[PDB]
Design a protein around this nucleic acid. Structure first.
Ligand SMILES: Nc1nc2c(ncn2[C@H]2C[C@H](O)[C@@H](COP(=O)(O)OP(=O)(O)OP(=O)(O)O)O2)c(=O)[nH]1
Ligand SMILES: [Mn+2]
Ligand SMILES: [Mn+2]
Length: 175
DNA sequence: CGTTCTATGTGTACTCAC
DNA sequence: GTGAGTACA
DNA sequence: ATAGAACG
């Protein structure tokens, strides 16, 4: 069920105004500023296996509800797997079935989440390997030295990459 | 000593014993 | 409930 | 990125 970069962007553009979740009866819309395209789509690969969306949820209490009660106005989908942090959907788009992957992160995690979910995997592996040799650990939630969050005065992914000590490259060029 | 090749990470969701 | 183990972000 | 191993 493969698709083009253009089809990818069409769908993401369509979902951007339509994602919401049920929170104890009421239907809360997810805001565009908290929807970030990730994976191969953000890396502008000509062909994609799926669409990967990162949702930034504004508080920890809400994690229990967003993905497990995710809603998409006017589009039929089925749920393959679903937990608080990762959700996989099969959506119907123009009489065709496409795979939509949803992930979640808290605001304090945004740049780590983006850095992780942008990929590619081989780039994650090598960046992390390097940090391990200097006794740091990195993941989707933060940077670490001996079980402790390194507080970093940074907001964007670019700021994080440069803080970590690596060449910043646009997603297309990461490898 | 230099060139080149190779290997490498960290966490989530689900299922199935006991 | 906990923990082993697979599949896979 | 980086470091070890095989090769020159
Ligand atoms: N596949 C995979 N992805 C990971 C892993 N760790 C972090 N990720 C992140 C980086 C990936 O780009 C992102 C989405 O995974 P996908 O498997 O959808 O791959 P991606 O979109 O790069 O390419 P594709 O979907 O294959 O066109 O999740 C991992 O171990 N495996
Ligand atoms: Mn993908
Ligand atoms: Mn994916």
């Amino acid at each position: 069920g493969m698709l083009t970069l253009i089809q990818g962007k069409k769908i993401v553009n369509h979902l951007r105004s339509r994602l919401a979740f049920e929170y104890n009866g009421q239907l809360i819309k997810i805001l565009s500023k908290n929807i970030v395209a990730v994976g191969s789509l953000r890396r502008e690969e000509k062909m994609l296996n799926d669409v990967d969306l990162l949702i930034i949820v504004p508080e920890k209490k809400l994690l229990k509800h967003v993905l497990p009660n995710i809603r998409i106005k006017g589009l039929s989908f089925s749920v393959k797997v679903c937990g608080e942090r990762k959700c996989v959907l099969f959506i119907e788009w123009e009489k065709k079935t496409y795979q939509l992957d949803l992930f979640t992160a808290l605001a304090e995690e945004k740049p780590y989440a983006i850095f992780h979910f942008t990929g590619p995997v081989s780039y994650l592996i090598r960046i992390r390997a390097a940090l391990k040799k200097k006794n740091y650990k990195l993941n989707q939630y933060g940077l670490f030295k001996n079980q402790t969050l390194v507080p970093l005065k940074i907001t964007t992914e670019k700021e994080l990459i440069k803080e970590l000590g690596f060449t910043y490259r646009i997603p297309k060029k990461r490898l």
